[PDB]
Amino acid sequence: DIRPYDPNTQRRVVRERLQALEIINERFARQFRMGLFNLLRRSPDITVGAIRIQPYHEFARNLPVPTNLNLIHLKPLRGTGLVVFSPSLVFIAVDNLFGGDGRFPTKVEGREFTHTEQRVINRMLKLALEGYSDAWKAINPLEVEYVRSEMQVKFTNITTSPNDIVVNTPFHVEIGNLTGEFNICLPFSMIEPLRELLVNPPLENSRHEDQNWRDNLVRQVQHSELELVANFADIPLRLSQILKLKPGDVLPIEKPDRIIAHVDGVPVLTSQYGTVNGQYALRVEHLIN
Amino acid sequence: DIRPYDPNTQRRVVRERLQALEIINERFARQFRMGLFNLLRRSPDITVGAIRIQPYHEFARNLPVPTNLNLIHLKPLRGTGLVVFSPSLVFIAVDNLFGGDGRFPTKVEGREFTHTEQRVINRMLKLALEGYSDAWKAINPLEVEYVRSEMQVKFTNITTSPNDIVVNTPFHVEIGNLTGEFNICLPFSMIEPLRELLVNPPLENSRHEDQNWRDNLVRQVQHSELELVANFADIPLRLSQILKLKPGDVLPIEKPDRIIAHVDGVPVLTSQYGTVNGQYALRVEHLIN
Amino acid sequence: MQDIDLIMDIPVKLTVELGRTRMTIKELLRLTQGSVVALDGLAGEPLDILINGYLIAQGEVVVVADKYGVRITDIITPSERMRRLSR
Amino acid sequence: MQDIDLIMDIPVKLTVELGRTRMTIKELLRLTQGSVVALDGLAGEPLDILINGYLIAQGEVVVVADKYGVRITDIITPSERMRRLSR
Amino acid sequence: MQDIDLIMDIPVKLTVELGRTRMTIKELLRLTQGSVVALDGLAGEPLDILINGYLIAQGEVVVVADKYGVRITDIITPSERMRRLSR
Amino acid sequence: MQDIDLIMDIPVKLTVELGRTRMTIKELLRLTQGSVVALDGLAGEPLDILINGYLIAQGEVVVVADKYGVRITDIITPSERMRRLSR
Amino acid sequence: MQDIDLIMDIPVKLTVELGRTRMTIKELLRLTQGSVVALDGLAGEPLDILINGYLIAQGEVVVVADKYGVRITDIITPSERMRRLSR
Amino acid sequence: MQDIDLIMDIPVKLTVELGRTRMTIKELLRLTQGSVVALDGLAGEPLDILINGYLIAQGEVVVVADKYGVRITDIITPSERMRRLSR
């Protein structure tokens, strides 16, 4: 079990199934299929790839160079999302929009996209953004805002560290022999606050019923019990003195102006000691806030 | 008799015969037969299948993929009902509405329903909703409101748990060689408050007579007898002390500000002890409410 | 024994009952605030002492400086227990 | 020994506790400014002395010219420690 | 409110109980290693969920990849709570 | 002894606990219907058996023809009890 | 402000802690040369960053051409700080 | 001795420190997210082991199946301790 430590190594984090994310992906796939059929005048076939959890560098190394990378923001959540379009899909869209029948196989170029191809990518991106926004709306309100387009991981650093966990959902688009692919990548920290919503499958809306459920849960927990402990004061000493504790030994302590009340080590208020009803009393002054 | 426990196992719950539900199903079958004859211009044959009680997952696994699932709400009862239309019935309806004679056997497709087929399903659904509402009205006022249509168990979770008990009543529709089938599924918790109404067979209305019966039952029960016990106070102790109980032993108790009156362990009021007519008396202060 | 010591660490609950009586529900409904209800027990009789609802001894009411107390007097030996349960 | 001397150079922290009590969270919410809360310990009982949250001895409260002090009286020998922890 | 947020910082303890039963001490002494003890609850019934020994909800047992889990199903609303405490 | 026989007539209550865990109140508020909550105990570990809230033995879960049962396996002898309470 | 600039001229000391653990003195005496001691923290968790013994942020270990470095990742905002101190 | 056994029951806290460095507050303010900070210690040097903030030994970092560990190598005998404190 004992292994030597390497600072350049990292581990994985079990499994983080997001059924709600998959449902959103399927809804977005339906909307994007409709949009692509409307745009290209031909029926596409969109297949939702398996959701992938991997470090950011692992996702980056698999991206062909050059590739179209678009920065988006999922308001009100903080972060920057990425929409990845493969060059093959862009070439297919350009060929279809300019009357190409697709007979000629695509040639590897490795060149920057032209401004016309940039406009084609923007035309795809707007529809994709609308579709994804509509898909997300079914479970939680979100707004997607495109930021800028880049053609290299050089222009990235959406993430603080290359080893940060990100969520990538591939999609495969087929309009014939074409098997183009586009991907959506989101950092895990962006969707971390909504982890509970995304993990368990969604239920019926019943917002008033859910609020009543929360209110009842609050009311029932209010009758729970705990232990209240008040620390009079603290003393710095040494172990040798402790070995010599004897009857009559006097240890000086600092006089506490206020008595702090702690619950399992959690301060809750500051008070002053008193003698009421023949027992020690604490006059509450201020709550810890 | 002794068996090992498995958290992934569950048992059944005897039999829950609902004669009123069967009568409602028969009335709905009559109304839907009339509606289908009016719509398709041909006489259908609707057979009410045996009512089935099974966990939700068992019902889900038997549904062909894809299938038309419609979400309905039975107001004022809380929950979401489902109306299941088999693809064969939808195909038969589409063929009949567009002049098809039904000679050609249906081909397995496994594809999403078209918007025209969606409108056909909606046309069937409205009549089915009217019929079922009218059938339910005969025993208890209810309103059925369609929510949304889905084509997979992915878009379900009408139930909190897959093992929840649901009630499914199959129906078989025949307009020739066609033997199409549609099902109605309702969670048991939705109809749980009305269990008494649905179990025993209905009688004549006699609402005034029933109210008088309830009033007489209330009046007769008012003369029943019980035992009233008032607990003076309680003490926390240990068994060793109990083994040493001797004459003259004094046990300190906390002085009760109020005396709580309990009936078979059920508190009913809080009072204070007194001495009236040479016997102990309790001055009632507040009732437990 | 050692198991007596083991159960000694287990706390138990003691209950003191002033008295008992029987009446109809209609009479209880007739009762209002300030109503007077009598008890079967008389004045000066030892009160029942119950452990988890089981009577084990009897005592007399005393006050300790501000707190009520029970001065144990007698036990509920099986003959007396059977006699009082037969009632 | 020599390791006792080594750990002697290591400072430790001492904690004096006035008393302890148990109550529900609802009762705590009912408490306001100036509220009175009782403690299980009585008047004049020796207070617990804790080292890093572990009780090791007991003492009595004294004042030194302007500063509170604890006059150690007894120890928490294992029999008494087990008896008080069993509570 | 703000005090709800204040008590939110205070951790609490949750307890899940499989079932309960009653028996005499003599029967417990008769029990040995490998003995079988029954419970009042039946198979498939929701288990009680207790916060500091107070029942607040019920759930169903599930296993999470290697760890047991409770799938909350219903609540202990005052009518049901009074009914089950009356037992 | 005879007092063991006397207390034998006194019924007691037994409690079986599946497991325990600790969490903040905010996390509990975040929990909704169908939420999953983990427990400290692992799979296959003996469950705690409590008499009036005091742990006295451990057992394993069995089903008797329709009813859950606990098959007692081990005890909570003072060394193990102190070790598990120290946690 | 200007006093922030004044204290800027005052250097401070930063401390990075790999992890923490608790053990008895007897176990430490049992330890010899080459002994293996475990830590509470797991592999890959951010390490604590302390200023004069006070935790203010967390980071990840990196190596700079021959020298270890800490890549700051998160902060110790009061909710998380209270949660980790409660442990 | 017997008091060594008594203090053995008292748990203590162990602290492992990766390294230390000195810098101005202005430099700390200049630091942002992802900034790189160097340490005085070199690569492969044994890390300091502290008990309640007091250095007592040194060790080497190892990983145990998923958890970091410290493999103790040397001690902080008074000559070396004085030499390193003089720095």
Numbering used by the authors:
A (entry chain O), B (entry chain U): 34 to 322
C (entry chain V), D (entry chain P), E (entry chain Q), F (entry chain R), G (entry chain c), H (entry chain d): 51 to 137
From the paper:
The bacterial flagellar motor is a huge bidirectional rotary nanomachine that drives rotation of the flagellum for bacterial motility. The cytoplasmic C ring of the flagellar motor functions as the switch complex for the rotational direction switching from counterclockwise to clockwise. The basal body is made up of the LP ring, MS ring, C ring, rod and export apparatus. Here, we present two high-resolution cryo-electron microscopy structures of the C ring-containing flagellar basal body–hook complex from Salmonella Typhimurium, which are in the default counterclockwise state and in a constitutively active CheY mutant-induced clockwise state, respectively.
Further local refinement on the four protomers using C34 symmetry-expanded particles improved the density map to a resolution of 4.0 Å. Each protomer is assembled by FliG, FliM and FliN with a stoichiometry of 1:1:3. FliG in the CCW-C ring consists of the domains FliGN, FliGM, FliGCN and FliGCC and adopts a twisted “V”-shaped architecture, which is distinct from the extended apo structure of FliG from A. aeolicus. FliM consists of three domains, FliMN, FliMM and FliMC, and adopts a lifting tong-like structure with FliMN and FliMC as arms. The protomer of the C ring has a “Y”-shaped architecture, and obliquely binds to the neighboring two protomers in a “S”-like manner, which generates extensive inter-protomer interactions within the C ring. The long linking loop LMC, which connects FliGM and FliGCN, binds into a cleft between α9 and loopα11–α12 of the FliGM–1 domain, close to the residues P169-A170-A171 (169PAA171), the deletion of which caused the CW-biased rotation of the motor, suggesting that the interactions play a key role in the rotational switching. The α15 helix of FliGCN and the following hinge loop LCC, which is formed by the conserved M233FLF236 motif, brace the FliGCC domain via hydrophobic interactions and stabilize its orientation in the upper region of the protomer. The αtorque (α20) helix of FliGCC, which interacts with the MotA subunits of a stator unit in torque transmission, lies on the top of the C ring. The stator-interacting charged residues, R281 and D288/D289, are located at the N- and C-terminus of αtorque, respectively. In the bottom subring, FliMC forms a heterodimer with the FliN1 subunit in a head-to-tail manner, while the FliN2 and FliN3 subunits form a homodimer in the same fashion.
